[PDB]
Design brief:
Chains A, B: telomeric repeat binding factor 1
CATH topology of chain A: Serine Threonine Protein Phosphatase 5, Tetratricopeptide repeat
PDB class: telomere binding
Strand content of chain A: under 5%
Order of helices and strands of chain A: HHHHHHHHH
Keywords: telomere binding, TRF1, telomere, dimerisation, trfh, DNA-binding, nuclear protein
Assembly: dimeric
Distance between the termini of chain A: 36 Å
Number of strands of chain A: 0
Largest sheet of chain A: none
Structural class of chain A: mainly alpha
Oligomer: homodimer
Shape of chain A: elongated
Entry title: Dimerisation domain from human TRF1
CATH superfamily of chain A: Telomere repeat-binding factor, dimerisation domain
């Protein structure tokens, strides 16, 4: 009448799924497979609710997932209802909190997000928001006195902190993560069978 | 630059998860772990959307899941909105369609569900519905001329086709399934590590 070790077995099988899906979510992300990334995130989110305690590595995983689903919605402005903040703004918050080295790349990804968070609003044609976003990210004299000039003039076109340079830098970061967890149980075992 | 075999790897890892969760969903079900069964079903449903094609064994799995989440909501009458039918009514439909032998047990489980589907409404105190349900399940002269007498008299108490006899028979069936898929990859491997 096995019991309790079963519960513990599930946790191991849970953590496996969590890393397998984080890996999946990453590939779809780099490979730009929209209707897929969404599908994997549903499973991630569902599997994640299935956990009430987490290791340091796992929290790292979860946040990377949260982080990527956010920027994955960047240009999607009704934004996320639970918090009246914009997706990239929320991605900015997670980024500067994930337990990770602040390399040169980290800083690059942070300024792209910071800036693009304004540009996206400017694109959607919502400059009243573009200003609101700008307010929340700046406002305490990081190029600022300049940016207020853009929102003001709806001068929506002139810096190399482009949306695509942002995705690139983020995709390049996903590759480290992507590799670091490619030998993770579930997937490694999965390929073995595909032979 | 691995590619495509990766997609195929995921499908194998998908089918693994699907059976692992079906197994999980079963234990929680037999062991009556409400806030858990719900959690596992979320993951099942999420993982299931992650599949666009399915083997015969897999469809068997899915339906058993669908089947159990339904009776798991039996006494829950607003019922499921997408279809203006009651949960047990819907569980009755799946049951008589799962690719499985119609043993003595099968027939038992079918008459319990059939009857309880009326009794639940009678319990919730909704006899107008109790009649509607009765209409949809009967009405073409299977104890019937009798049952219309109960709904009429709100004589809500007097047969051994009890709700609990229903859960028992269903729980006993879950044990075959439960066993048949206990050596399924994921879980077996999971326990090995728990040692």
């Amino acid at each position: 009448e096995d019991a309790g070790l079963v519960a513990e077995a599930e946790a191991v099988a849970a953590g496996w799924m969590l890393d397998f899906l984080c890996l999946s979510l990453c590939r779809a992300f780099r490979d730009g497979r929209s209707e897929d990334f969404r599908r994997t995130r549903n499973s991630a989110e569902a599997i994640i609710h299935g956990l009430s305690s987490l290791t340091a590595c796992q929290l790292r995983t979860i946040y990377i997932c949260q982080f990527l689903t956010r920027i994955a919605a960047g240009k999607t402005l009704q934004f996320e209802n639970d918090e009246r903040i914009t997706p990239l703004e929320s991605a900015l918050m997670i980024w500067g909190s994930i337990e990770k080295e602040h390399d040169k790349l980290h800083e690059e990804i942070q300024n792209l997000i910071k800036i693009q968070a304004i540009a996206v609003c400017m694109e959607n044609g919502n400059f009243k928001e573009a200003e609101e976003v700008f307010e929340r990210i700046f406002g305490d004299p990081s190029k600022l006195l300049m940016i207020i000039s853009q929102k003001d003039t709806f001068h929506s076109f002139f810096q190399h902190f482009s949306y695509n340079h942002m995705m690139e830098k983020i995709k390049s970061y996903v590759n480290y993560v992507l590799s670091e967890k490619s030998s993770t149980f579930l997937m490694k075992a999965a390929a073995k069978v595909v032979e």
